[PDB]
Amino acid sequence: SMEGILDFSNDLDIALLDQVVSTFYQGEGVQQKQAQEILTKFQDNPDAWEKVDQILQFSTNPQSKFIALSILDKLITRKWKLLPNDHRIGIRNFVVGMIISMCQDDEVFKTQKNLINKSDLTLVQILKQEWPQNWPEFIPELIGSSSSSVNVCENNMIVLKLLSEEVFDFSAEQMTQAKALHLKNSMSKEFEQIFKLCFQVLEQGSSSSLIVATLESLLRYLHWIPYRYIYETNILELLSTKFMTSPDTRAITLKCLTEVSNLKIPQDNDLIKRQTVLFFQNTLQQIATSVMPVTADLKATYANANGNDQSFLQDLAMFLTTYLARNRALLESDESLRELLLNAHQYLIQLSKIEERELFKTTLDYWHNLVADLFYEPLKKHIYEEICSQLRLVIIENMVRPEEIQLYKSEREVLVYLTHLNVIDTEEIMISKLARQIDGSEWSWHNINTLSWAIGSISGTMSEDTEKRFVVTVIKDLLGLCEQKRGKDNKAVVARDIMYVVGEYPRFLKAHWNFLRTVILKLFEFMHETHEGVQDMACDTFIKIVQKCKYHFVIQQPRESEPFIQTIIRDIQKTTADLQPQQVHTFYKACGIIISEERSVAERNRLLSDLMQLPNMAWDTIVEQSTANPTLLLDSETVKIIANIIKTNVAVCTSMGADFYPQLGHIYYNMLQLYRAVSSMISTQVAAEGLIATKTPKVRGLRTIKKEILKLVETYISKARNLDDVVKVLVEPLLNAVLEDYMNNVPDARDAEVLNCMTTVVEKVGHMIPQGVILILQSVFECTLDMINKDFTEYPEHRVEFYKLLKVINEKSFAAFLELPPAAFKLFVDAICWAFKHNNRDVEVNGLQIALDLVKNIERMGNVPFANEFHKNYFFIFVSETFFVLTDSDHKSGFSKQALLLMKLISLVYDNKISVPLYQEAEVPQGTSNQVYLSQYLANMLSNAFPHLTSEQIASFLSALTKQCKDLVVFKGTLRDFLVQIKEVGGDPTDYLF
Amino acid sequence: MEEDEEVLYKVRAKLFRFDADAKEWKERGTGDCKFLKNKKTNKVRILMRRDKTLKICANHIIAPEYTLKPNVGSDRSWVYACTADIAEGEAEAFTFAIRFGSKENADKFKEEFEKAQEINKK
Amino acid sequence: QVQFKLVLVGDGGTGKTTFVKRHLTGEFEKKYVATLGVEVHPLVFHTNRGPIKFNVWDTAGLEKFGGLRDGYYIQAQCAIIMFDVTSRVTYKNVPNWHRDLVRVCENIPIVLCGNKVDIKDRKVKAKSIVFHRKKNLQYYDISAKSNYNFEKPFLWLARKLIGDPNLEFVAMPAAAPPEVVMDPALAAQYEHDLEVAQTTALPDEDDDL
Ligand SMILES: Cc1ccc(Cl)cc1N1CCN(c2ccc(C(=O)O)cc2NC(=O)c2ccc(Br)cc2)CC1
Ligand SMILES: Nc1nc2c(ncn2[C@@H]2O[C@H](COP(=O)(O)OP(=O)(O)OP(=O)(O)O)[C@@H](O)[C@H]2O)c(=O)[nH]1
Ligand SMILES: [Cl-]
Ligand SMILES: [Cl-]
Ligand SMILES: [Cl-]
Ligand SMILES: [Cl-]
Ligand SMILES: [Cl-]
Ligand SMILES: [Cl-]
Ligand SMILES: [Cl-]
Ligand SMILES: [Cl-]
Ligand SMILES: [Cl-]
Ligand SMILES: [Cl-]
Ligand SMILES: [Cl-]
Ligand SMILES: [Mg+2]
């Protein structure tokens, strides 16, 4: 029975609408849902707007009236200009009358704010269509109707706020450039009257709700109005005194004064400087006298979260930071403004202690601006000494772990600046915080961690000699702490913090070999502690120290028999015996960093040989068995050992790159045999068990072997220096091992890592293997395209890797696409356009880039049959495909590269850089230029795609497009203007002359 | 309602329930899986709470008739039918899968689950 | 038990429905099935101040599935605005969702949520996310997939709606579960269902759990 309102052949039962709406908003489960679907169909009915008049008069449910206004909104924004003038004046008068009526009934004004606000926005949508050209008297009439009633005056301030937002704040994407300028200039022309009204209401005062609505509108005005309206009237004084004293007006006034602080102002005028000082003085005086003194515990207040206190304190941080970042130099020169300057900063110190991460970040951005200034600006830091001292404590007590990269970075930079400004103050605070960890008063895991992060963050800031005494003092104190503390949990926490600090002080380690050796040997001891986090931290600290101090491991140090790298490698089985595989790989990676420091070839190769001794021997036995008995590969444990051998090779190759070649050379042939044998077993298992086999531990293990092999080869080739060896030794066996196996596996068994490996091969040596690139295409192109061209979802990794491979082949070995048979070259164009249509930003962007690069590749060929055949066959496919994704609203992230592509395509024809006619014969007078035929094709294409556009709109749009096809920013503007105009009826064709 | 229970075994797990309609596993929770012995009835239940919300994703007796079976895809999971779980209130039947950090953890789980099955026979 | 209307808004594909579903059932939906208009789902948390119920209005982000649009916001007491830290456009659109929301709901607590912080290649950097500051929105990095800060938006809104800054989520009480005997006329029904379930792979066998 609820479905009655959808039956438009009968008149609307208003009371039925009110039940449906009630059921939707106030109902439950199955009943709520049926109402939802019915209301949606009602609202989306293209005639529904005809019923709005009826609903607004005769419904008693304000939810129904709200939905009526939504229906009216769709008409006003989309189809308004189809209506006769008399009908548009009728709707306009109905809406105004309903608003005035609701405002004159105090009861309805108080209780129905939702419906009134919605009415005001509906009115503003009409103003966007009608005003001022077809309504020049709107503003005078609004100003007049304001003196008649407090309620109407307040609501008129809401209409003006919404008008200012729609014209100035949200116009950029919603209107043409021309219509945005028209409405901006229109509001600018009548602002003088509007301001007079707002100032009067603010002077003559009384009604709090009226004052707040007026100030809300002023906040919007401040985004665009000239400074003189603030600085040449009483208004700065009213905002900074009267409106800061009452709490109803205080929040909005503070937001107004923040924006006042951002006005475009003359820089060479003493009166304006004094005015800028005075409003700051007034505002801070009102806060100290009416809200809280400078000493107040804002941490406690914010935590207690009474009323609007949290919001007010956020707004105060935004005001102080914004004003001081622009104006503190005004307060710095003058003895009489010293107290104001330091009080404002003292408020920021108190705000900085609030437990609220996002507010802390806001104050921290200001503190960064200040301490950066004090580091470089002469004769300034002495002003801020007591502020800076307090800030040192605030930053040290709030240091986060370096894992939180942006916040750690911000905090470190502020603490580094503050340490430079007073190293003694920073040192004293850190040592005393450490003393309160040792005496137990401040002891906790969080607190020792925080302090350790802070101590670590300032490494490099002290003189080497001050650093030496400081670091020794901290390591001694942290040792004392560990001994003192009871039970592995506590000892592990402090040992991790010791490892952390030592890791952040390489300069000290590099200068004290005795201590570095001890640290490393202690990390090795810790690689035998199973207590959670200790092995990970010992391994992370080992590689971190190695990254920074690697030279000290590769030389013979005084009083040592050999370079320490030799000592590490000799004991590696014992050192790593208790580590998990990922920890072993870190350790070997770290050893690879050291070995790459050795630039004597013979010695590097020997160290590489010795490091790889255990994995190589495990490899040799597993190959002297794997081959001699192919069954041994089915055993879970053998597969894990093989995968871990390959992973150890990847880790060492990551740190050594080009230096890794002799190791890759040792395993390369047997590694590719293993790849073939493992492939066999995967193929076998999928035959015997089904596609489900690809989910089993055994097949995942085998596939892991294949993926780590492909990862090892891509790692080496991506860093290789000798490309002749890559081409002559590596590529041919690689392609023989991987390409046919990829092609001849079922989709669910194909490793996307193959595409990734081939992308690196084409990248690095594509120019040297023209026949190899052809073979890569023949093997992967059609079978990968068939996996990914049924939908946008299946095989997401293959999808991404596929368009990366085509991108690089198109960049490096375009001749591989010339070799394709005509039908295969057609699939390539289909594949590029398919990429355009994706929502996945990885695919879409490569798709558009391939399209650009291909046009560029075709252009390069000059006037020859392939380039002329390409244009005849594909130019209009590329133009129309690019227009489709530009205009369909489902591909907005692609806008910039879509516009670039369309600009290139249009410019080819505009510059007469296409040699043949683009039209097939007897389709247009045979003399006709490609420029006239392109104009015709696009006019026709846009007319069928957007039939509600006029011929005038399309012709004006295309005239603008073709004129602007050498100016990307302006061309993009014309495109965005067209995207606005296709969403409505009756768009002005003169907009394209902007 | 856990203050009258001894904690026999604690392990981190992810729990799945089988939707027969969709023919796919759907995750039900991640967090601490606990074996709890009621000190009045000496009855051992599985009680599993989600990370951060601590909402109950499993609450049922380790019935003697239940059998832990391998999943084709995992060497660190068990599947088993449950006839009466009250995580979401009213007792319902589920096909559950529970997955652990390691094969070791899953094997230990099964050891402990048999230990609790015997304790439940008394 | 008190109940509050929560409206969830943001661009299509940002993770609104995925986030709510995980809160309702514990499940992680990998597929993108666009919401049509709105889905309404009751969501209950147990607090040290008793249970709190959110009536969650999970709205459509795609223009073409928008339905009643701002019509969904009427008498909302709180809101989440969602974007995707892997998609810049979704953050560029946050001011538009906030605009439409506060025009209808003038004085409600709102959390801004940057979803999908589990994805390595992050596009909307911490440095860039400042919109919440002048608008007095709470902000959280979240992941519906890793459950990073998963409970934070609701805990913050609960603290604001109840007016207790020390409100905590607590372990929901755990009743003794019933004992049963297997019904012998479904013995043959169970071996089947259990056979299908053993031979259907568990998702994401490469995760920590
Ligand atoms: C115990 C510990 C755990 C982890 C790590 Cl990474 C290192 C250690 N050290 C081992 C023994 N060390 C000493 C043991 C004894 C003595 C000594 O006074 O003779 C000195 C030192 N070392 C230092 O003073 C020191 C080392 C590195 C850095 Br950066 C800064 C300071 C100190 C703690
Ligand atoms: N990696 C990752 N993916 C996520 C996360 N949250 C959601 N997704 C995925 O992203 C998509 C989001 O889908 P939905 O939750 O339906 O998106 P929505 O915001 O509800 O979209 P509309 O209903 O159209 O407004 C799905 O494929 C989810 O699996 C997250 O935290 N991480
Ligand atoms: Cl202007
Ligand atoms: Cl300045
Ligand atoms: Cl050095
Ligand atoms: Cl190994
Ligand atoms: Cl081909
Ligand atoms: Cl296709
Ligand atoms: Cl089109
Ligand atoms: Cl239209
Ligand atoms: Cl629920
Ligand atoms: Cl942030
Ligand atoms: Cl904030
Ligand atoms: Mg959704």
GROMACS .gro file of N, CA and C in nm, chain A residues 24-26 32 36 39-40 43-44 63 66-67 70 74 78 114 117-118 121 161-162 165-166 170 173-174 255 258-259 262 303-305 308 310-311 314-315 318 356 358 361-362 365 406 692 695 700 841-842 890 892-893 983, chain C residues 5 36-38 40 53 57 62-64 67-72 74-75 84 86-89 92-93 95-96 99 103-107 116 121 123 126-127 129-130 132-134 136-139 156 160 165 199-201 205-206:
model
  327
   24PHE      N    1   1.032   0.551   0.698
   24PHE     CA    2   1.176   0.559   0.660
   24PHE      C    3   1.258   0.615   0.777
   25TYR      N    4   1.222   0.732   0.832
   25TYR     CA    5   1.308   0.804   0.929
   25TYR      C    6   1.297   0.740   1.068
   26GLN      N    7   1.177   0.700   1.110
   26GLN     CA    8   1.147   0.656   1.249
   26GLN      C    9   1.125   0.504   1.256
   32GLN      N   10   1.139  -0.003   0.719
   32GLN     CA   11   1.227   0.113   0.689
   32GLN      C   12   1.280   0.101   0.546
   36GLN      N   13   1.234   0.333   0.207
   36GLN     CA   14   1.360   0.387   0.146
   36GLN      C   15   1.352   0.376  -0.006
   39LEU      N   16   1.055   0.594  -0.161
   39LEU     CA   17   1.090   0.739  -0.157
   39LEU      C   18   1.193   0.775  -0.265
   40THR      N   19   1.293   0.689  -0.286
   40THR     CA   20   1.402   0.708  -0.385
   40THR      C   21   1.340   0.713  -0.525
   43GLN      N   22   1.133   1.043  -0.562
   43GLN     CA   23   1.221   1.161  -0.580
   43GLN      C   24   1.283   1.161  -0.721
   44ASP      N   25   1.319   1.044  -0.775
   44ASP     CA   26   1.392   1.028  -0.903
   44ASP      C   27   1.295   1.036  -1.022
   63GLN      N   28   0.983   1.638   0.721
   63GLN     CA   29   1.072   1.545   0.646
   63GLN      C   30   1.026   1.535   0.501
   66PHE      N   31   1.114   1.862   0.323
   66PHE     CA   32   1.260   1.856   0.299
   66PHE      C   33   1.285   1.783   0.167
   67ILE      N   34   1.228   1.663   0.154
   67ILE     CA   35   1.242   1.577   0.032
   67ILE      C   36   1.179   1.649  -0.087
   70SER      N   37   1.440   1.882  -0.209
   70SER     CA   38   1.544   1.805  -0.281
   70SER      C   39   1.501   1.788  -0.427
   74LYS      N   40   1.686   1.944  -0.784
   74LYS     CA   41   1.728   1.871  -0.907
   74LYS      C   42   1.675   1.945  -1.030
   78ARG      N   43   1.938   2.148  -1.289
   78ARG     CA   44   1.954   2.068  -1.413
   78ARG      C   45   1.866   2.123  -1.528
  114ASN      N   46   1.592   2.273   1.028
  114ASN     CA   47   1.624   2.182   0.914
  114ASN      C   48   1.552   2.229   0.787
  117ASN      N   49   1.655   2.606   0.672
  117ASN     CA   50   1.792   2.601   0.616
  117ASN      C   51   1.786   2.544   0.474
  118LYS      N   52   1.713   2.435   0.455
  118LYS     CA   53   1.699   2.366   0.326
  118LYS      C   54   1.629   2.460   0.227
  121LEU      N   55   1.875   2.727   0.109
  121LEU     CA   56   1.969   2.671   0.008
  121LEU      C   57   1.896   2.660  -0.126
  161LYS      N   58   2.508   3.409   0.375
  161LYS     CA   59   2.618   3.313   0.404
  161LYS      C   60   2.623   3.206   0.294
  162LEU      N   61   2.511   3.139   0.269
  162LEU     CA   62   2.500   3.032   0.166
  162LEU      C   63   2.533   3.089   0.027
  165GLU      N   64   2.921   3.135   0.009
  165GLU     CA   65   2.979   2.998  -0.006
  165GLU      C   66   2.961   2.949  -0.150
  166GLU      N   67   2.842   2.960  -0.207
  166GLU     CA   68   2.812   2.899  -0.340
  166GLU      C   69   2.890   2.975  -0.449
  170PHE      N   70   3.264   2.729  -0.327
  170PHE     CA   71   3.233   2.600  -0.394
  170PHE      C   72   3.201   2.619  -0.542
  173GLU      N   73   3.428   2.410  -0.904
  173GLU     CA   74   3.402   2.282  -0.974
  173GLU      C   75   3.257   2.278  -1.024
  174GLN      N   76   3.168   2.366  -0.976
  174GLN     CA   77   3.020   2.353  -0.996
  174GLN      C   78   2.967   2.446  -1.106
  255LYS      N   79   3.702   3.263   1.501
  255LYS     CA   80   3.720   3.215   1.361
  255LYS      C   81   3.726   3.336   1.267
  258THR      N   82   4.080   3.501   1.309
  258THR     CA   83   4.176   3.414   1.238
  258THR      C   84   4.177   3.452   1.090
  259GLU      N   85   4.061   3.464   1.026
  259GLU     CA   86   4.056   3.496   0.880
  259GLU      C   87   4.098   3.642   0.861
  262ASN      N   88   4.448   3.672   0.797
  262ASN     CA   89   4.489   3.627   0.660
  262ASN      C   90   4.448   3.729   0.550
  303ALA      N   91   4.071   1.805   2.882
  303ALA     CA   92   4.043   1.667   2.927
  303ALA      C   93   3.901   1.659   2.985
  304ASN      N   94   3.858   1.761   3.061
  304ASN     CA   95   3.727   1.764   3.132
  304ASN      C   96   3.614   1.785   3.032
  305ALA      N   97   3.643   1.847   2.918
  305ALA     CA   98   3.555   1.849   2.799
  305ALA      C   99   3.417   1.906   2.834
  308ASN      N  100   3.160   2.360   2.515
  308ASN     CA  101   3.226   2.382   2.383
  308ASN      C  102   3.374   2.415   2.403
  310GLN      N  103   3.653   2.233   2.424
  310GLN     CA  104   3.750   2.165   2.334
  310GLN      C  105   3.759   2.246   2.204
  311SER      N  106   3.645   2.272   2.142
  311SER     CA  107   3.632   2.354   2.019
  311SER      C  108   3.694   2.493   2.037
  314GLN      N  109   4.076   2.460   2.055
  314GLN     CA  110   4.125   2.435   1.916
  314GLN      C  111   4.130   2.569   1.841
  315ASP      N  112   4.019   2.642   1.843
  315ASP     CA  113   4.003   2.771   1.770
  315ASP      C  114   4.106   2.872   1.821
  318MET      N  115   4.439   2.784   1.671
  318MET     CA  116   4.438   2.821   1.527
  318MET      C  117   4.460   2.973   1.515
  356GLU      N  118   4.581   1.569   2.290
  356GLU     CA  119   4.500   1.569   2.166
  356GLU      C  120   4.597   1.575   2.048
  358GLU      N  121   4.587   1.578   1.725
  358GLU     CA  122   4.568   1.666   1.607
  358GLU      C  123   4.590   1.812   1.646
  361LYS      N  124   4.970   1.863   1.677
  361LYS     CA  125   5.030   1.881   1.543
  361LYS      C  126   5.014   2.028   1.500
  362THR      N  127   4.900   2.090   1.531
  362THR     CA  128   4.873   2.230   1.488
  362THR      C  129   4.974   2.322   1.558
  365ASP      N  130   5.341   2.268   1.423
  365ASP     CA  131   5.369   2.339   1.296
  365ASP      C  132   5.408   2.484   1.328
  406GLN      N  133   5.584   1.127   0.979
  406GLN     CA  134   5.564   1.274   0.970
  406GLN      C  135   5.576   1.341   1.108
  692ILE      N  136   4.206  -2.593  -0.712
  692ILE     CA  137   4.221  -2.590  -0.563
  692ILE      C  138   4.368  -2.615  -0.526
  695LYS      N  139   4.592  -2.343  -0.392
  695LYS     CA  140   4.564  -2.293  -0.255
  695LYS      C  141   4.638  -2.378  -0.150
  700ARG      N  142   5.180  -2.359  -0.295
  700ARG     CA  143   5.218  -2.220  -0.255
  700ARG      C  144   5.370  -2.218  -0.229
  841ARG      N  145   4.394   0.349  -1.032
  841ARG     CA  146   4.484   0.461  -1.073
  841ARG      C  147   4.615   0.408  -1.135
  842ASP      N  148   4.661   0.289  -1.096
  842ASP     CA  149   4.788   0.228  -1.143
  842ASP      C  150   4.778   0.200  -1.294
  890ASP      N  151   3.307   0.894  -1.429
  890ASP     CA  152   3.356   0.775  -1.353
  890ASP      C  153   3.510   0.767  -1.359
  892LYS      N  154   3.756   1.068  -1.299
  892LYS     CA  155   3.797   1.207  -1.267
  892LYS      C  156   3.945   1.213  -1.229
  893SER      N  157   4.000   1.107  -1.168
  893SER     CA  158   4.143   1.098  -1.130
  893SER      C  159   4.231   1.099  -1.257
  983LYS      N  160   2.584   1.886  -1.761
  983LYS     CA  161   2.505   1.844  -1.642
  983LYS      C  162   2.376   1.925  -1.632
 1121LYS      N  163   2.172   0.837   1.607
 1121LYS     CA  164   2.181   0.830   1.460
 1121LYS      C  165   2.321   0.877   1.416
 1152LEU      N  166   2.345   0.137  -0.263
 1152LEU     CA  167   2.231   0.201  -0.333
 1152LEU      C  168   2.157   0.286  -0.230
 1153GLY      N  169   2.176   0.418  -0.232
 1153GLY     CA  170   2.109   0.509  -0.139
 1153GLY      C  171   2.170   0.502   0.000
 1154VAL      N  172   2.115   0.417   0.086
 1154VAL     CA  173   2.162   0.399   0.226
 1154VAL      C  174   2.131   0.256   0.271
 1156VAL      N  175   2.089   0.089   0.662
 1156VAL     CA  176   2.078   0.125   0.806
 1156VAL      C  177   2.106   0.000   0.889
 1169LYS      N  178   2.400   0.231   2.159
 1169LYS     CA  179   2.357   0.185   2.025
 1169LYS      C  180   2.374   0.299   1.925
 1173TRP      N  181   2.366   0.497   0.946
 1173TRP     CA  182   2.316   0.527   0.809
 1173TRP      C  183   2.439   0.531   0.718
 1178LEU      N  184   2.871   0.726  -0.455
 1178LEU     CA  185   2.863   0.746  -0.602
 1178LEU      C  186   2.739   0.830  -0.633
 1179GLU      N  187   2.757   0.937  -0.708
 1179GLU     CA  188   2.650   1.033  -0.747
 1179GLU      C  189   2.530   0.955  -0.800
 1180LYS      N  190   2.553   0.855  -0.886
 1180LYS     CA  191   2.446   0.786  -0.962
 1180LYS      C  192   2.368   0.693  -0.868
 1183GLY      N  193   2.067   0.844  -0.416
 1183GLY     CA  194   1.932   0.840  -0.355
 1183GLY      C  195   1.891   0.977  -0.299
 1184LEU      N  196   1.856   0.982  -0.170
 1184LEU     CA  197   1.797   1.101  -0.105
 1184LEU      C  198   1.906   1.200  -0.066
 1185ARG      N  199   2.033   1.161  -0.077
 1185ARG     CA  200   2.150   1.250  -0.056
 1185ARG      C  201   2.142   1.307   0.086
 1186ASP      N  202   2.129   1.440   0.099
 1186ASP     CA  203   2.131   1.511   0.229
 1186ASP      C  204   2.005   1.475   0.309
 1187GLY      N  205   1.901   1.426   0.243
 1187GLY     CA  206   1.781   1.369   0.306
 1187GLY      C  207   1.816   1.264   0.411
 1188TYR      N  208   1.929   1.193   0.395
 1188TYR     CA  209   1.975   1.091   0.492
 1188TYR      C  210   2.029   1.158   0.618
 1190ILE      N  211   1.911   1.406   0.804
 1190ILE     CA  212   1.808   1.468   0.894
 1190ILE      C  213   1.814   1.401   1.032
 1191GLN      N  214   1.833   1.483   1.137
 1191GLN     CA  215   1.828   1.444   1.281
 1191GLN      C  216   1.942   1.344   1.313
 1200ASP      N  217   3.994   0.788   0.129
 1200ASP     CA  218   4.089   0.677   0.103
 1200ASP      C  219   4.227   0.740   0.088
 1202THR      N  220   4.481   0.631  -0.028
 1202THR     CA  221   4.542   0.587  -0.156
 1202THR      C  222   4.478   0.660  -0.275
 1203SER      N  223   4.379   0.749  -0.255
 1203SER     CA  224   4.311   0.824  -0.365
 1203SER      C  225   4.295   0.973  -0.332
 1204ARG      N  226   4.378   1.059  -0.391
 1204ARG     CA  227   4.382   1.207  -0.367
 1204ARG      C  228   4.243   1.272  -0.387
 1205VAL      N  229   4.171   1.232  -0.491
 1205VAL     CA  230   4.040   1.293  -0.524
 1205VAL      C  231   3.948   1.278  -0.401
 1208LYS      N  232   4.021   1.545  -0.167
 1208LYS     CA  233   3.981   1.674  -0.230
 1208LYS      C  234   3.830   1.696  -0.214
 1209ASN      N  235   3.753   1.588  -0.206
 1209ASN     CA  236   3.605   1.589  -0.199
 1209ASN      C  237   3.556   1.599  -0.054
 1211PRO      N  238   3.585   1.842   0.174
 1211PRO     CA  239   3.514   1.967   0.199
 1211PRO      C  240   3.371   1.970   0.146
 1212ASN      N  241   3.344   1.898   0.036
 1212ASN     CA  242   3.208   1.890  -0.025
 1212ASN      C  243   3.116   1.805   0.064
 1215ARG      N  244   3.050   2.015   0.384
 1215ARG     CA  245   2.955   2.122   0.346
 1215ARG      C  246   2.811   2.070   0.353
 1219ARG      N  247   2.532   2.166   0.675
 1219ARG     CA  248   2.416   2.249   0.635
 1219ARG      C  249   2.287   2.192   0.694
 1220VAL      N  250   2.280   2.060   0.711
 1220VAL     CA  251   2.165   1.986   0.770
 1220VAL      C  252   2.186   1.962   0.921
 1221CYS      N  253   2.307   1.929   0.966
 1221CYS     CA  254   2.342   1.894   1.107
 1221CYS      C  255   2.445   1.996   1.160
 1222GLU      N  256   2.399   2.104   1.222
 1222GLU     CA  257   2.482   2.225   1.245
 1222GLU      C  258   2.581   2.205   1.360
 1223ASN      N  259   2.550   2.121   1.460
 1223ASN     CA  260   2.627   2.118   1.587
 1223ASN      C  261   2.643   1.973   1.634
 1232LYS      N  262   4.245   0.290   0.473
 1232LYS     CA  263   4.334   0.208   0.387
 1232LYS      C  264   4.480   0.246   0.414
 1237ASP      N  265   5.180   0.211  -0.066
 1237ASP     CA  266   5.192   0.329  -0.156
 1237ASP      C  267   5.082   0.430  -0.121
 1239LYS      N  268   4.905   0.791  -0.087
 1239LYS     CA  269   4.897   0.908  -0.178
 1239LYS      C  270   4.858   1.035  -0.100
 1242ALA      N  271   5.022   1.254   0.560
 1242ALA     CA  272   4.993   1.324   0.688
 1242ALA      C  273   5.001   1.476   0.669
 1243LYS      N  274   5.110   1.526   0.611
 1243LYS     CA  275   5.137   1.671   0.589
 1243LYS      C  276   5.014   1.739   0.528
 1245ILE      N  277   4.683   1.652   0.533
 1245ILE     CA  278   4.551   1.635   0.601
 1245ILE      C  279   4.540   1.735   0.716
 1246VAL      N  280   4.482   1.852   0.687
 1246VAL     CA  281   4.463   1.967   0.781
 1246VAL      C  282   4.315   2.014   0.782
 1248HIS      N  283   4.037   1.910   0.892
 1248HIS     CA  284   3.966   1.888   1.020
 1248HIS      C  285   3.993   2.001   1.122
 1249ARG      N  286   4.104   2.073   1.112
 1249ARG     CA  287   4.152   2.164   1.220
 1249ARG      C  288   4.053   2.281   1.236
 1250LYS      N  289   4.034   2.360   1.132
 1250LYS     CA  290   3.940   2.474   1.136
 1250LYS      C  291   3.796   2.425   1.152
 1252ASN      N  292   3.693   2.166   1.342
 1252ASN     CA  293   3.682   2.101   1.475
 1252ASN      C  294   3.639   1.955   1.458
 1253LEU      N  295   3.687   1.889   1.354
 1253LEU     CA  296   3.663   1.742   1.337
 1253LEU      C  297   3.774   1.667   1.410
 1254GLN      N  298   3.739   1.557   1.476
 1254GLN     CA  299   3.839   1.456   1.516
 1254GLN      C  300   3.893   1.391   1.387
 1255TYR      N  301   4.019   1.352   1.387
 1255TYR     CA  302   4.083   1.281   1.273
 1255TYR      C  303   4.148   1.152   1.324
 1272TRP      N  304   3.534   0.776   2.026
 1272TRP     CA  305   3.541   0.924   2.035
 1272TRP      C  306   3.399   0.979   2.033
 1276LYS      N  307   3.173   1.184   2.326
 1276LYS     CA  308   3.110   1.316   2.295
 1276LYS      C  309   2.958   1.311   2.319
 1281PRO      N  310   3.439   1.201   2.917
 1281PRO     CA  311   3.568   1.181   2.851
 1281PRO      C  312   3.641   1.052   2.891
 1315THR      N  313   3.728  -2.827   0.188
 1315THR     CA  314   3.777  -2.824   0.047
 1315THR      C  315   3.756  -2.685  -0.013
 1316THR      N  316   3.708  -2.588   0.066
 1316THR     CA  317   3.709  -2.444   0.030
 1316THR      C  318   3.821  -2.375   0.108
 1317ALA      N  319   3.922  -2.322   0.038
 1317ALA     CA  320   4.044  -2.261   0.096
 1317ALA      C  321   4.004  -2.142   0.183
 1321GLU      N  322   4.602  -1.659   0.308
 1321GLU     CA  323   4.689  -1.755   0.381
 1321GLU      C  324   4.830  -1.697   0.402
 1322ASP      N  325   4.859  -1.577   0.348
 1322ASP     CA  326   4.991  -1.509   0.363
 1322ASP      C  327   4.992  -1.408   0.478
   0.00000   0.00000   0.00000
